[PDB]
């Protein structure tokens, strides 16, 4: 996260850390959507250009964390994968279209002050809040600059009008994507960066004051560059696939 802030304790109880076993290392962001299901970006597990393709056994889930490197005794819970589910049409060859994946845990995690699932939006929540200028919040333990943070970082960023998004880049942008960030004209700045991948773009419903995951941290060109924006997987658009997988694998 660049030009973000330390998270408060209990700020993102759904934040999840994708951690590599050997060598022990942060792999990606991710999120808690149920006591057995974590949401992340497909590229966290599979990116052939970088010989990236993880198996369930290669990884661990770390829920309830605040400190990046510490083992937060009596607070964080660390879990194991029973199966990885990647979107069948994730486009890693061209533009990372449908950059989405599910991870089912071995046993359920227990909820706490620090551990709690975020909601997934209904069509109506999305129509209401996925509006240019409305802001979301991104969190992660990624790069501070296009360096490493001590604790979870947070930024609020305005959603950006689709033309602007498209005009910022040469990549073919899709409806399964949205971009977010300040314009270079707006003054403030901030962005997700390397290591924030799979983390959540979240918004708080002013209709029922619940927190909704609208986006997943997916890609960008550099971090916090003027007139560049963060791109996020459109979670509602792929929501049918999410309930399918969950409905199909209990």
């Amino acid at each position: 996260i660049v030009e973000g802030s330390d998270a408060e304790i209990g700020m993102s109880p759904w934040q999840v850390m994708l951690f590599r076993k050997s060598p022990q290392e942060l792999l990606c962001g991710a999120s808690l959507i149920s006591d057995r299901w974590v949401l992340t970006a497909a590229h966290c597990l599979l990116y052939p250009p970088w010989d990236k393709n993880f198996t369930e056994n290669d990884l661990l889930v770390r829920i309830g964390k605040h400190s990046r490197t510490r083992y937060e005794r009596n607070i964080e819970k660390i879990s194991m994968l029973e199966k990885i589910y990647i979107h069948p049409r994730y486009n890693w060859r061209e533009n990372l279209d449908r950059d989405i994946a599910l991870m089912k845990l071995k046993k359920p995690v227990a909820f706490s002050d620090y551990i709690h699932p975020v909601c997934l939006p209904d069509r109506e929540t999305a129509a209401s809040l996925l509006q240019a200028g409305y802001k979301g919040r991104v969190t992660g333990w990624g790069n501070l600059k296009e360096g490493q943070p001590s604790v979870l970082q947070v930024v609020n960023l305005p959603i950006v009008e689709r033309p602007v998004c498209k005009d910022s880049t040469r990549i073919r942008i899709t409806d399964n994507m949205f971009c977010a960030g300040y314009k270079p004209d707006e003054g403030k700045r901030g962005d997700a960066c390397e290591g924030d991948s799979g983390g959540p773009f979240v918004m708080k419903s002013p209709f029922n004051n619940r927190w909704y995951q609208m986006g997943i941290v997916s890609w960008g060109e550099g971090c916090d560059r003027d007139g560049k924006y963060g791109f996020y997987t459109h979670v509602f658009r792929l929501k049918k696939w999410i309930q399918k997988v969950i409905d199909q694998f209990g």
Partner: peptide, 27 residues
């Protein structure tokens, strides 16, 4: 069901330091 309500904030009706920034943007 209990989704999206944080034990240390919404469940105790406490607000985090910048959530009002989101609200005020939901213009």
């Amino acid at each position: 069901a209990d989704c999206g309500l944080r034990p240390l904030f919404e469940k105790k009706s406490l607000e985090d330091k910048t959530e009002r920034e989101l609200l005020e943007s939901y213009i």
